[PDB]
């Protein structure tokens, strides 16, 4: 019984109209939108109850709106996307009309606003098989996944073993690193480790996959460059178990 | 109006307790909210505090409210790794809108058992010019510092639990395409344990 | 206008006894001037006053956060709001403008001797009439307390009199805004 | 012994709503819904206390919702109009060429809708006229004060004209110098 939001992430070019989607909890009477610009505090945008806005930000009516289409959905519309509007957008809902209860937040939508869509690049994904020294020394085996040369940030890395996604044995960088810190348009790199027992990696019937969900260009966006369109996509790399 | 949280960030050793504070307006108080926000996830509420001098408890998490002096304390008894989160504080006046503090980012430093610091060389398979070096199996005292060369990339330490050989391990990754680069020097700008295993 | 009207009127009451020692809170709801449901501090739960307010009392009582907000209004809301205004409300004192005057005629004829007491606060006043320093216990036609609605009161206590030259009539007003009973005179 | 009352209402299909605080029969403040702000009865109150109008606005929104729930629940039962009892009186005893205030007091009525007009020599007067909001009564009917600052003369005739749906014809309450 959670608040829903779509999409996970969204990449947009300056001056465009963006429509952020949300599904408040079914019986809930109050809906909200909050936003957090990286480094800054979580800011209130708009409150809504009984098909009417309750409270709103100083910034709200000039730059935004809210539509309640059916009796299941609620949406926030950014009129003309600004660079300052790159933030994490949360939709929230409250049960009671009295306001003394808790607010339930959705998973959020990370909106990246770009001045120019030219410097957008998907990631390159490679899997590196375990060190033989490590297996010999510990009877443990760790595969590493590198995701490099992507722009912008906020990518989703996951491991798949024999088709099922795994969280056990895994650890992924909480933040990516800049490939060229001297640049404002610096592409990013990210790593993840998956550690399994040597017995497991040594079984060649065992399949290992690492994939990265990248968010970039929409099919409607303008693309004049020669390289393939840096559209939203899943880039993957795999390795098979080695008896050695 | 304005809500302030102190400290912005905090480090605590697994097993140890910590507390942090929230400063909110002393006039026109209706409620005070405490949310836990794990990096992966969405802000999830812990407590909504309305009565001054009341104390709330959710397992190991505890909170106190002082309306008259405009402050609240959040207590984490005996930190566990799953408590690593950004703890957010919110003030509610007559409406429903929440005014937030900047948060307190809590990092629960793990209790690493049976360390075996080692720097290993993983193989390329086979579509990359990169050779990767893994600094693994070191305790929580060891700190990973940034590279001194612009063409070598080093990631910060990260803890994984195997739940197959059910232990926790720290590790960092270094990489380069460079003809030069080797695992024996990859981590030279870091304070490495004296007994770190470099195989040959 | 001829279209039918529908009115919902909530009233949140805070009754104070011995200043702030015993406070009683009532959360009352009226549909078309008929009370449907209520919460009384002294009861501790919502009770339907009518059949229309029965689902509301059941629902509001089943919501622990609604109940505990009602149950605590006596300190959170009542005692708090009492203390907010006390200075300019509970301790407001405005002095009355006492003025005696007849309704006009000749002595030895009957007349009403008015005692206009205007612009005072609070409404706690005791007005007394005197004929040559002796309290006239009867023959007084009071108007009672008139609430002006501007945080001001007014009362008119007319005396039924048969005036004779040499007689001095005196109006004595006792009120909290004054330490000494105010006195106005009219000689025949 | 005192009584503070948070007295709200919402009325349909007029779509009128009110919120006010009453201390022992007198208005501390009311919230202006058009201008979304607190209107203190006596200016001095504003200097010693504060109020956040959103609390009223949020309550009025709920009141609007509850009225609609209630009217459907009651098989669409309307209110029974209770006509008012109009009274004209002055602030102070009247004296010629000394300024005074005329008080028109509308009482014991429901619904809270009235058209009040001041008339000098049968002609309407807009200059200096002030009014209270619908004040509450213990019988759940309303009160309302209309004010008229005036200069007492022997040639003036004042009338308070009140219109209500519980009245068969507009009631005129007369005042004149003795």
């Amino acid at each position: 019984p959670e608040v829903t939001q779509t999409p996970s992430h969204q990449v947009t070019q300056m001056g465009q109209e963006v429509i952020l989607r949300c599904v408040p909890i079914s019986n809930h009477l109050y809906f909200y939108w909050y936003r957090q610009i990286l480094g800054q505090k979580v800011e209130f945008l708009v409150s809504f109850y009984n098909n009417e806005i309750s409270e709103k930000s100083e910034i709200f009516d000039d730059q935004f709106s809210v539509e309640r289409p059916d009796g299941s959905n609620f949406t926030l519309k950014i009129r003309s996307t600004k660079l300052e509007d790159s933030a994490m957008y949360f939709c929230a809902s409250s049960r009671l009309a009295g306001g003394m209860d808790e607010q339930f937040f959705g998973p959020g939508t990370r909106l990246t606003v770009l001045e120019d869509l030219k410097n957008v690049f998907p990631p390159e994904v490679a899997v590196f098989e375990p060190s033989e020294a490590e297996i010999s020394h510990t009877q443990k085996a760790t595969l590493v996944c590198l995701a490099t040369g992507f722009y912008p940030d906020h990518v989703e890395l996951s491991w798949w073993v024999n088709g099922k996604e795994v969280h056990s044995g895994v650890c992924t960088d909480p933040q990516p690193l800049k490939e060229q810190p001297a640049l404002n348009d610096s592409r990013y790199a990210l790593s993840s480790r998956l550690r399994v027992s040597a017995t497991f990696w040594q079984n060649p019937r065992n399949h290992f996959r690492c994939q990265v969900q990248f968010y970039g260009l929409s099919e409607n966006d303008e693309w004049t460059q020669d390289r393939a369109k840096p559209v939203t996509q899943i880039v993957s790399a795999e390795a098979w178990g080695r008896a050695d | 109006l304005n809500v302030e949280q102190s400290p912005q960030s905090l480090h605590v050793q697994e097993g140890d307790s910590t507390n942090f504070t929230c400063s909110f307006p002393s006039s026109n108080f209706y409620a005070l909210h405490w949310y836990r926000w794990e990096t992966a996830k969405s802000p999830e509420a812990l407590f909504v505090m309305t009565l001054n001098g009341d104390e709330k408890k959710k397992g190991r998490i505890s909170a106190t409210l002082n309306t008259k002096e405009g402050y609240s304390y959040l207590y984490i008894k005996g930190s566990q790794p799953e408590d690593s989160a950004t703890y957010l504080c919110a003030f509610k006046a007559a409406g429903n809108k929440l005014t937030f503090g900047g948060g307190t980012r809590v990092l629960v430093k793990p209790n690493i058992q049976n360390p075996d610091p080692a720097v290993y060389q993983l193989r390329d398979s086979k579509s990359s010019d990169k050779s990767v070096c893994l600094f693994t199996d070191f305790d929580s005292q060891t700190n990973v510092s940034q590279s001194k060369d612009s063409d070598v990339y080093i990631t910060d330490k990260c803890v994984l639990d195997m739940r197959s050989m059910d232990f926790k391990s720290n590790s960092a990754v270094a990489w380069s395409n460079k003809s030069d680069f080797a695992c024996a020097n990859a981590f030279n700008n870091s304070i490495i344990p004296e007994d770190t295993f470099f195989p040959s | 206008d001829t279209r039918p009207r529908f009115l919902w009127q909530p009233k949140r009451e805070c009754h104070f006894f011995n200043g702030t020692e015993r406070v009683r809170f009532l959360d009352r709801y009226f549909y078309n001037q008929e009370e449907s449901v209520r919460f009384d501090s002294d009861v501790g739960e919502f009770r339907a006053v009518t059949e229309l307010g029965r689902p509301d009392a059941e629902y509001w009582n089943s919501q622990k956060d609604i109940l505990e907000q009602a149950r605590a209004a006596v300190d959170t809301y009542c005692r708090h709001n009492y203390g907010v205004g006390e200075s300019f409300t509970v301790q407001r004192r405005v002095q009355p403008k006492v003025t005696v005057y007849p309704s006009k005629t000749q002595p030895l004829h009957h007349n009403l001797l008015v005692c206009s007491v205007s612009g005072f606060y609070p409404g706690s006043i005791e007005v007394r009439w005197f004929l040559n320093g002796q309290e006239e216990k009867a023959g007084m036609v009071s108007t009672g307390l008139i609430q002006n609605g501007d945080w001001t009161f007014q009362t008119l206590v007319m005396l039924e009199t048969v005036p004779r030259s040499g007689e001095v009539y005196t109006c004595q007003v006792e009120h909290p805004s004054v330490t000494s009973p105010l006195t106005v005179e009219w000689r025949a | 012994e005192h009584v503070i009352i948070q007295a709200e209402f919402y009325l349909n299909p007029d779509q009128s709503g009110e919120f006010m605080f009453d201390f022992d029969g007198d208005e501390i403040f009311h919230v202006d819904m058009a201008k979304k702000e607190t209107v203190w009865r006596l200016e001095e109150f504003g200097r010693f206390a504060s109020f956040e109008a959103q609390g009223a606005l949020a309550n009025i929104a709920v009141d609007k919702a509850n009225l609609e729930i209630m009217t459907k629940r009651s098989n669409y039962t309307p209110i029974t109009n209770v006509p008012p009892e109009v009274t004209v009186l002055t602030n102070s005893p009247v004296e010629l060429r000394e300024p005074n205030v005329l008080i028109c007091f509308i009482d014991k009525f429901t619904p809270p809708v009235v058209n009040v007009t001041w008339l000098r020599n049968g002609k309407p007067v807009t200059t200096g006229v002030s009014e209270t909001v619908f004040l509450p009564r213990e019988d759940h009917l309303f009160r309302k004060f209309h004010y008229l600052p005036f200069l007492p003369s022997t040639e003036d005739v004042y009338d308070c004209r009140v219109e209500h749906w519980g009245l068969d014809e507009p009631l005129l309450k007369h005042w004149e110098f003795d």
Partner: peptide, 13 residues
């Protein structure tokens, strides 16, 4: 100090 509103609740159901 501030005057506090006793916040209203929506009716059943």
């Amino acid at each position: 100090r501030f005057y506090k509103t006793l916040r209203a609740e929506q009716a059943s159901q």
